[PDB]
Amino acid sequence: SYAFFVQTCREEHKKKSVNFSEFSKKCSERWKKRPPSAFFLFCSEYRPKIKGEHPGLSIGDVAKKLGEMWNNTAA
Amino acid sequence: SGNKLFRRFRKMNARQSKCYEMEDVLKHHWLYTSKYLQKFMNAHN
Amino acid sequence: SGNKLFRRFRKMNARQSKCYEMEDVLKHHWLYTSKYLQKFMNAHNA
């Protein structure tokens, strides 16, 4: 119950919200290694392809695409 | 089994002297047989 | 002096099989007489 009235007063005097310092004295009068390999270079080089050609998805789809591309091609 | 442990301790875990070998072996065997120390070795569960 | 080490290695640092103890004891006693390894245990005196 101590927060409901405060939230209502906050909506009240905010409808007329980043200043908490100058709000302190307001409530007083209210309640009263591992060298990489060819595959890691493949990743680091071909992930930005799908990361910049289709940025609308996270790099999970980029990893999925790079993986289905590596599995279909040779090394 | 304790006889085997005694044969081992008298040879490699005691002062080689008649005046103190037996006390050393007895104390070392008492320490070895304790369970409060064996729990620290079962730190797999 | 090495006979002692042989006995102890055979009793405590080898496979207790008739066709495996010889090579185990030999390898262990060879490793035990390596000055390269002995230099590590004396690094405190430096």
Partner: protein
């Protein structure tokens, strides 16, 4: 008591003192609360004779893992008469209590062992050895040396294992590289000379007794064991018209060099 409270209540008591500390940090340091507080705590630790914990703290302040090389763990395991089972028990106990690796596991030690065993370093004799192979990767050659073990020949009731002689000498010489280098450096000789060194080796052999036999299958072996060993005693180089002593065993009768 004090400092035994949880959050939002332990600061409630030392709030003023923290304010004073940050005031001084702004006055002299300028805001370096981190260093001054760490140093004050280090001195508070050293005042009560706690060099161990304070050294551990100043070591973890850097943020590096205090680990041991596999060769070091191997040397500790060998030079302290520890079986692989006891070493594994100690390893497991330490890793489970401290929650981190200070020793190396058994496979790392086993892998590092292969560098020291004979048959790992290349070499070649300038005059090829008569009746001796030129392959340089053999390990533990069988002792019988292809002896006939059928029913028609003389009966065989012994077993043996052994290294190859030249590979063993090469491994022994490679195990004493730093010794020879420091000896040459201590004799006013350059450490890049390739003179014809002269190695002197001592040989020994004696049959043991009261050697118990094990059960199980296999041949019926006697209860006696014979061993054969060698020892590099002295190495000298011929510089000019003399024989400079570059190495000498300090303790020849010791078991650490047989």
């Amino acid at each position: 008591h004090l400092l035994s409270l949880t959050r939002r209540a332990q600061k409630h008591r030392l709030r003023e003192l923290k304010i004073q500390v940050k005031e001084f940090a702004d006055k002299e340091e300028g805001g370096d609360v981190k260093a001054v507080c760490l140093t004050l705590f280090l001195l508070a630790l050293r005042a009560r004779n706690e060099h161990r914990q304070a050294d551990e703290l100043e070591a973890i302040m850097q943020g590096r893992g205090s680990g041991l090389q596999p060769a070091v763990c191997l040397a500790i395991r060998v030079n302290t008469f520890l079986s692989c089972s006891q070493y594994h028990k100690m390893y497991r106990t330490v890793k489970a209590i401290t929650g981190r690796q200070i020793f190396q596991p058994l496979h790392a030690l086993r892998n590092a062992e292969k560098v020291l065993l004979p048959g790992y370093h290349p070499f070649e004799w300038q005059p090829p050895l008569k009746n001796v192979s030129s392959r340089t990767d053999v390990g533990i050659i069988d002792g019988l040396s292809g002896l006939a073990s059928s029913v028609d020949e003389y009966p065989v009731d012994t077993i043996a294992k052994r290294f190859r002689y030249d590979s063993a000498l090469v491994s022994a010489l490679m195990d004493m590289e730093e010794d020879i280098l420091e000896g040459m450096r201590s004799q006013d000789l350059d450490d890049y000379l390739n003179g014809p060194f002269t190695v002197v080796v001592k040989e020994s052999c004696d049959g043991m007794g009261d050697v118990s036999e094990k059960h199980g299958s296999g041949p019926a072996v006697p209860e006696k064991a014979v061993r054969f060993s060698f020892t590099v005693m002295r190495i000298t180089i011929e510089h000019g018209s003399q024989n400079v002593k570059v190495f000498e065993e300090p303790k020849p009768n010791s078991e650490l060099c047989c």
